[PDB]
């Protein structure tokens, strides 16, 4: 991921789409892509807040991830055009918004991160 959420004048909706799914236009994604990307984003955020956080509780982390995994299994089973699946997507998008942290840790291996382009590599030319 390019990790350019806070740059390029993204609106809140675009930033939320980028966080939940790798794309800014989730409509292009299919059902499996949407579900898998949302599950990955939810697990990443839960890990960031309840493993690498302030006085994290690993038992609570385990319970939370288990519940999320069961819910996402049900979501994947559900059909794309279902109000229940829409409610699940809205719930977890709201969870992502709730856990949104300004100045959240951005890994140095991603573009646009701190230290991303500190050096200019000279070409064979």
């Amino acid at each position: 991921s390019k990790a350019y959420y806070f740059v390029k004048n993204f609106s809140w909706a675009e930033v939320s789409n980028l966080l939940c799914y790798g794309t800014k236009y989730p409509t292009v994604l299919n059902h499996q892509q949407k579900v898998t990307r949302l599950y990955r984003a939810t697990l990443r955020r839960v890990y960031a807040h309840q493993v690498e956080g302030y006085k994290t509780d690993f038992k609570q982390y385990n319970e939370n991830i288990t519940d999320i995994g069961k819910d996402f299994n049900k979501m994947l089973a559900l059909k794309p055009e279902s109000l229940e699946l829409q409610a699940y997507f809205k719930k977890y998008e709201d969870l992502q918004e709730e856990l949104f942290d300004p100045a959240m840790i951005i890994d140095e291996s991603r573009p646009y991160a701190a230290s991303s382009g500190r050096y200019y590599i000279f070409d064979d030319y």
Binding site: R118, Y119, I121, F122
Partner: peptide, 8 residues
């Protein structure tokens, strides 16, 4: 620690 050295 530091960045990997590259040709200049």
């Amino acid at each position: 620690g530091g960045f990997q050295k590259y040709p200049i």
